[PDB]
Amino acid sequence: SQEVMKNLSLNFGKALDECKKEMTLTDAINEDFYNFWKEGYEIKNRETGCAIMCLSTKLNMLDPEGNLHHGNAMEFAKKHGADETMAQQLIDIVHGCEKSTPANDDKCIWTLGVATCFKAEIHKLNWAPSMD
Numbered sequence: 001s002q003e004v005m006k007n008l009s010l011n012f013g014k015a016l017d018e019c020k021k022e023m024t025l026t027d028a029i030n031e032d033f034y035n036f037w038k039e040g041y042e043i044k045n046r047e048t049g050c051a052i053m054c055l056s057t058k059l060n061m062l063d064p065e066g067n068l069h070h071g072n073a074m075e076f077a078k079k080h081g082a083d084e085t086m087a088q089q090l091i092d093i094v095h096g097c098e099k100s101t102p103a104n105d106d107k108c109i110w111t112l113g114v115a116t117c118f119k120a121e122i123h124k125l126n127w128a129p130s131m132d
């Protein structure tokens with residue numbers, strides 16, 4: 001559901017401010033988040049990946065390192081309105097994307113790659129929202 005992807009995006013972004021008084025980042029990132037679900041948009045700023053990883057770690061979906069906590073990621077989805085089957089589809093995609101993106105000590109760059117892959121698969125389902 002697009003409606004459910006919108007609420008998940010909004011709620012994922014609530015932790016963002018805060019991250020900011022904790023990593024201190026820029027208007028390039030706000031532009032990337034604003035554009036995230038636009039078709040064909042490409043994220044080019046490394047520090048957007050840092051933001052996503054900060055966000056996810058604050059929500060307990062990433063560990064110290066960047067392996068997804070599947071259980072906590074399911075719980076986030078369900079918290080913000082995914083039913084069991086949508087949540088399980090989402091986790092599978094993120095897990096597929098971790099497997100497919102190359103190892104990188106640079107976790108900010110690793111995150112961008114996973115997050116690109118994720119966005120792509122969400123478009124393929126027609127679940128990318130108009131953040132409107």
Ligand SMILES: CCCCCCCCCCCCCCCCI
Nearest residue numbers: 008009012056061073090114115
């Ligand atoms: C399973 C829940 C996803 C919820 C919100 C999506 C918004 C954008 C962040 C998702 C991309 C994840 C990228 C790196 C893996 C850490 I979950």
